[PDB]
């Protein structure tokens, strides 16, 4: 067991951040969630199980930190995805906007939809589902964020390891859920391995 720094994050909003994040991909994964598309999001035969990583959060970190709404360069968090949110209540509790950007993201997929075929094209990306597909990325299981209360925003970086969002390949694989997984939480659909 190993604490991540006393940086001025809260163990309540990296909690949030982590149970929300694992708490969708369920839903994804168990054919839960309804997709703007139509119907539901095809149900996962292995999506992956999060662990929070303090190292990831240190990346995420050095983003926020700088109070500036705007992705991070492949090289200041290298071999990661990421995911931004903002909004303009700078003092906002960290764990309330740990809530706010995970819905934000996650909502998506109900708003602008994404369908039944999960191959990241451009057309897909261009509806503007990108931070929905990085949250349940079947391969990304490492998940590290920060909440900083800038000046006249309340920001929010999530990074995830490995990267999601690869062109051209499949958000995850579509199947009937621990299809594929011989480590499975049957409760919940979801694979540590």
Wanted: glycine residues 12%; contains cysteine.
């Amino acid at each position: 067991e190993f604490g991540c720094p006393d940086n001025g994050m809260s163990e309540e909003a990296r909690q949030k951040f982590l149970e929300m994040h694992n708490s969708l991909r369920s839903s994804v994964a168990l054919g839960q969630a309804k997709d703007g598309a139509g119907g539901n999001a095809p149900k996962a035969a292995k999506m992956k199980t999060m662990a929070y990583d303090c190292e990831v959060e240190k990346t995420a970190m050095n983003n926020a930190k700088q109070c500036v709404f705007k992705h991070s360069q492949p090289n200041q968090r290298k071999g990661l995805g990421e995911n931004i949110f903002m909004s303009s209540d700078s003092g906002m509790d960290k764990a309330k906007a740990a809530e706010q950007a995970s819905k934000a993201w996650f909502g998506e997929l109900a708003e602008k939809g994404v369908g039944q075929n999960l191959k990241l094209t451009g057309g897909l990306f261009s509806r503007g589902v990108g931070h929905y597909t990085q949250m349940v990325w079947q391969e990304t299981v490492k998940l590290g964020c920060y909440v900083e209360a800038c000046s006249n925003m309340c920001y929010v970086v999530c990074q995830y390891g490995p990267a999601g969002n690869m062109m051209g390949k499949d958000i995850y694989e579509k199947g009937e859920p621990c299809s594929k997984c011989e480590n499975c939480d049957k409760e919940k659909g979801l694979c540590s391995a």
